[PDB]
């Protein structure tokens, strides 16, 4: 839950997709980072605040971004200046979500209890109540400052509250041009606390002394340029309007307001160790809309990194591409769709659907749709979750095709040793995952493109152990689909229906015949010395072993030769001539294998001898058993295995 920050974000995205009212994609971002910083502060250890401080700041930024995207878009045709409205959006997040010390404890009853008659600790208790009131007013606590000013006998501060309440009645209107020049002159008079000296300059739009700013934090530090522009833009337009008159004016005001970049050149220069933090400098880029300019700049200095930034920049583009179509750079979009799917490795199991909302071109083309062919191995949970998100047809025909064609180039080293052994454990451990993508795509129409993948690996077996026999067992783990591919094949029209349905049916008969010979050869070899002294059951079982084999040989010779001779698709004939030429000698030795173990019973001698001696004699009428010796090299092997019967049968 709390640990899976990415999962929470994904859920919010999913809800929006179901609905497809558009301003709800970013509003859910305020419920994630909040519960996280709350789960490390409600109960638990106190040292977790070293990580909760990162969550205590990532949530206030999502609040400031929600007011900027709705002002420049949701312009309803209801019943002027569009750039001055940004100052109001900056004041809402700069006033509501600010730090405020609570009310002071042990407030004195009467005044001057220790009594130039007051001690040094009396102006401090007066400045303590002065700072408690100088802070609440800066955060918009009129409702609280108005009661706070009346409560502490602090009547010296109430005279300006209504002056602000009179300035608030003039701001809602959108004379007082002379009242702005008196407080600035009051800020140049001596005799004021440091907290009250900064309060008079902040309301008008002036700069106070630097000794009061030293205490001021570099984050808060930004309200100085915000209040000056307001005091100057209203005096400019106010000046333009001139609704006070020249006489009402007293002193010249800096009515030349600067831009955002000239103000940011000074806030990150007063307290740069914290004003340029990676979670606070993102608010200037929302006014510039440059997405891949802050993350792709941390991949070059590899000689000398922050996961919270990659999750927000990538989540911004899915909204930036949606808020304004193509607002995110097209290069940045595909660079964000690729950096997200790659960084989402520890959490790639559930986000296999959230990457489709911004398909764009990385998904329509074989770009962002080929990475799923690298993790879908054994677990059946991720294979079924991708079935949602409204994706099928060609995407299913492009993920299954990219799953079997992308591993065919890696088996190129498996066709070089045509006369030696090799390391086939990886092929016997990675090709098993190469059959779950097609077995999961239970489509009777997309069966022709995958039914040939097993026959394409018969030549990688070569001598010694064969990989097709183990591959024949993977197909037995999911048969019956032959009935689904034969019924669905009569649904779509096809012209060459006299050769496409005959190759699939003949390959299934040879493979099932091959899987049967492998299991028949595993039961006679596992016999060894079975039945012990009671060979009566073996006298009939070995009789069945010797009959089922003498029949299997004549049957397997007729299945491979059933391909006739002259055919146009001779590429399928030159590949099956070796597999047929490789299943011949292994049968004659099994009857002779009853002359090493069943030789303790002089019964397989007169039988297994002539049974294998004529196996080459009748293998001379059907075109001399073709030339299985010409396709494998096993000629003298047959000459010696049978020649040995002249020192045992006599």
């Amino acid at each position, epitope marked *: 839950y709390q640990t899976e920050r990415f999962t929470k974000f994904s859920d919010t995205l999913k809800e929006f997709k179901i609905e497809q009212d558009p301003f709800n994609i970013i509003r859910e971002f305020r419920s994630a980072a*909040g519960q996280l910083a709350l789960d490390l502060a409600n109960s638990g250890d106190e040292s977790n605040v070293i990580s909760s401080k990162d969550w205590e700041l990532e949530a206030r930024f999502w609040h400031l971004v929600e007011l900027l995207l709705v002002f420049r878009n949701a312009d309803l045709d209801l019943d002027d200046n569009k750039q001055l409205y940004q100052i109001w959006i900056v004041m809402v997040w700069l006033k509501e979500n600010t730090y405020v010390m*609570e*009310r002071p404890k042990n407030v004195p009853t009467s005044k001057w209890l220790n009594s130039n008659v007051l001690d040094v600790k009396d102006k401090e208790e007066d400045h303590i109540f002065f700072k408690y009131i100088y802070e609440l007013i800066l955060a918009g606590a009129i*409702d*609280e400052a108005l*009661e706070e000013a009346k409560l502490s006998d602090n009547i010296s501060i109430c005279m300006i509250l209504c002056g602000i309440q009179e300035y608030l009645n003039p701001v809602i209107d959108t004379k007082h041009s002379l009242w702005r020049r008196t407080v600035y002159s009051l800020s140049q008079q001596a005799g004021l606390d440091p907290y009250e000296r900064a309060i008079y300059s902040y309301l008008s739009g002036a700069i106070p002394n630097q000794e009061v700013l030293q205490y001021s934090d570099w984050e808060s530090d930004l309200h100085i340029h915000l209040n000056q522009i307001l005091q100057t833009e209203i005096e400019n337009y106010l000046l333009e309007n001139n609704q006070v008159g020249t006489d009402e004016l007293i002193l010249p005001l800096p009515s030349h307001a600067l831009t955002v970049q000239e103000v940011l050149n000074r806030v990150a220069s007063r307290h740069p160790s914290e004003s340029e933090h990676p979670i606070r400098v993102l608010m200037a880029s929302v006014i510039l809309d440059s997405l891949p300019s802050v993350i792709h700049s941390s991949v070059e200095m590899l000689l000398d990194d922050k996961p919270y930034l990659l999750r927000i920049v990538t989540h911004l583009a899915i909204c930036l591409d949606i808020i304004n179509p193509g607002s995110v750079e097209e290069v940045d979009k595909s660079k964000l769709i690729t950096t997200y799917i790659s960084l989402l490795k520890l959490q790639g199991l559930y986000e296999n659907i959230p990457i489709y909302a911004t398909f764009l071109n990385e998904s329509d083309c074989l770009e962002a749709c080929s990475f799923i062919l690298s993790s879908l191995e054994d677990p059946q949970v991720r294979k079924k979750q991708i079935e949602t998100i409204n994706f099928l047809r060609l995407p299913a025909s492009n993920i299954l095709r990219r799953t079997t064609q992308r591993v065919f180039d890696e088996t190129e080293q498996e066709y070089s040793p045509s006369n030696e052994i090799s390391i086939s454990f990886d092929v016997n451990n990675i090709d098993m995952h190469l059959i779950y993508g097609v077995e999961w795509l239970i489509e009777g129409k997309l069966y022709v493109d995958a039914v040939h993948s097993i026959i394409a690996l018969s030549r990688r077996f070569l001598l010694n152990g064969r990989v097709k026999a183990l591959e024949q067992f993977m197909e037995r783990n999911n048969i019956g689909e032959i009935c689904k591919n034969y019924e669905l094949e009569k649904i779509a029209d096809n012209i060459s229906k006299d050769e496409n349905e005959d190759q699939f049916l003949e390959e299934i008969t040879q493979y099932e015949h091959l899987i049967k010979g492998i299991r028949e050869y595993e039961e006679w070899q596992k016999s060894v010395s079975l039945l012990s002294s009671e060979s009566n059951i073996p006298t009939l079982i070995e009789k069945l072993q010797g009959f089922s084999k003498d029949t299997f040989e004549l049957i397997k010779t007729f299945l491979v030769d059933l391909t006739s001779s002259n055919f146009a698709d001779s590429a399928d004939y030159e590949i099956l001539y070796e597999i047929r030429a490789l299943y011949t000698p292994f049968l004659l030795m099994e009857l002779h294998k009853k002359l090493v173990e069943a030789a303790k019973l002089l019964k397989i001698p007169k039988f297994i001898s002539e049974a294998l001696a004529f196996t080459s004699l009748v293998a001379n009428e059907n075109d001399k058993i073709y030339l299985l010796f010409q396709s494998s090299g096993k000629l003298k092997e047959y000459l010696d295995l049978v020649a040995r019967t002249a020192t045992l049968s006599n």
Partner: nanobody
């Protein structure tokens, strides 16, 4: 330790009324599963049915909810609160 005492929530029927009083010992909503959204400025889903009022110069907020529907069943929090449940049965 400034506190925010909220009261007035409860379970009503579709079409009933409620009065949420918030006294700042010193209005947003969250549905079951969704994110905290602002209710009261008035949200587009409560404009014309909910009314907000405040005592001039004080830190108190009252929200009168008339014509309540099943889309307003959630936990309401105060901001300037622990939460007060307001459910409406269909």
């Amino acid at each position: 330790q400034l506190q925010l005492v909220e009261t007035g929530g409860g379970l009503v029927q579709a079409g009933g009324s409620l009065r949420l009083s918030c006294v700042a010992s010193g209005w947003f909503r969250q549905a079951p599963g969704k994110e905290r959204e602002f209710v009261a400025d008035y949200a587009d889903s409560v404009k014309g049915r909910f009314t907000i009022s405040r005592n001039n110069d004080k830190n108190t907020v009252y929200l009168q909810m008339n014509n309540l529907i099943p889309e307003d069943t959630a936990v309401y929090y105060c901001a300037a609160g622990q939460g007060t449940q307001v459910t409406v049965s269909s």
